[PDB]
Amino acid sequence: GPGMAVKHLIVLKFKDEITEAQKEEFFKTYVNLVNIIPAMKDVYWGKDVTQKNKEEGYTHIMEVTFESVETIQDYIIHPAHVGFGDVYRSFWEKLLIFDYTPRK
Amino acid sequence: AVKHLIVLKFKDEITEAQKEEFFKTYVNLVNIIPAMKDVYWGKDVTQKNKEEGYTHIMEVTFESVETIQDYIIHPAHVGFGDVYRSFWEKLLIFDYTPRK
């Protein structure tokens, strides 16, 4: 329906070499993409506190909220894009990205 | 507020109707388990993930990490896991506080 959210779920394990300062700057830059990418409306992230899957090693979760029925290609080609961009794609040891519309 | 996040891959044998049954039953848990706040789920549309990766996301909101645990040990959630764990091949759980 109109105004339904399209969400991207970014699931991350950082490489051991990545510093706490670097991680902080990474998330700061990602949240600021809301002001740069028109269709991007919100970014929220956090650190897993449970560690229920330590063998899979993922530690961080980032939720990106986009407007539906709008192009997001400017995000895809953005230098800061976590998977595709030159700036940060070397930061992660492991990375999953999902694309879903939340419903109930 | 905190989030209990589930990343899920169903067993190969599970049908579309069974996936819908799973989510309907899970969402109804909010009518039963006091600790729970709102639940949303979605299906991943990424073609790359579909072949052998996780396929579904469930987000559950809670007041605190403590009330997440209240939900974990509730008889209704125990009962759900007892009869629907068979539906999933693998999953990931994350408990975290969203921030910006």
UniProtKB/Swiss-Prot annotation, chain B:
- What are the positions of the active site? 71 (acid/base catalyst), 74 (acid/base catalyst)
Q: Where are the transmembrane segments?
A: none
Tell where it localizes. Answer: Cytoplasm
Reactions it catalyzes: 3,5,7-trioxododecanoyl-CoA = olivetolate + CoA + H(+)
Query: EC number(s)?
Result: 4.4.1.26
Q: A Gene Ontology biological process annotation? A: olivetolic acid biosynthetic process
Q: Which SMART domains match?
A: Dabb (SM00886)
Q: Where does Mg(2+) bind?
A: 30, 33, 36
Q: Which UniProt keywords apply?
A: Cytoplasm, Lyase, Magnesium, Metal-binding
List, alphabetically, the GO terms of the cellular component aspect: cytoplasm
The Swiss-Prot or TrEMBL record annotates one GO molecular function as: lyase activity
Q: In which tissues is it expressed?
A: Expressed in glandular trichomes and at lower levels in female flowers.
Residues covered by the Stress-response A/B barrel domain: 2-96
Query: Which residues bind 3,5,7-trioxododecanoyl-CoA per the record?
Result: 4, 71
Predominant location: cytoplasm
Q: How does it assemble?
A: Homodimer.
Function of the molecule: Involved in the biosynthesis of cannabinoids-related terpenophenolic natural products, which have pharmacological activity. Polyketide cyclase which functions in concert with OLS/TKS to form olivetolic acid. Has no intrinsic polyketide synthase activity and requires the presence of OLS to produce olivetolic acid.
Could you identify this protein by its name?
Olivetolic acid cyclase
Give the species. Answer: Cannabis sativa
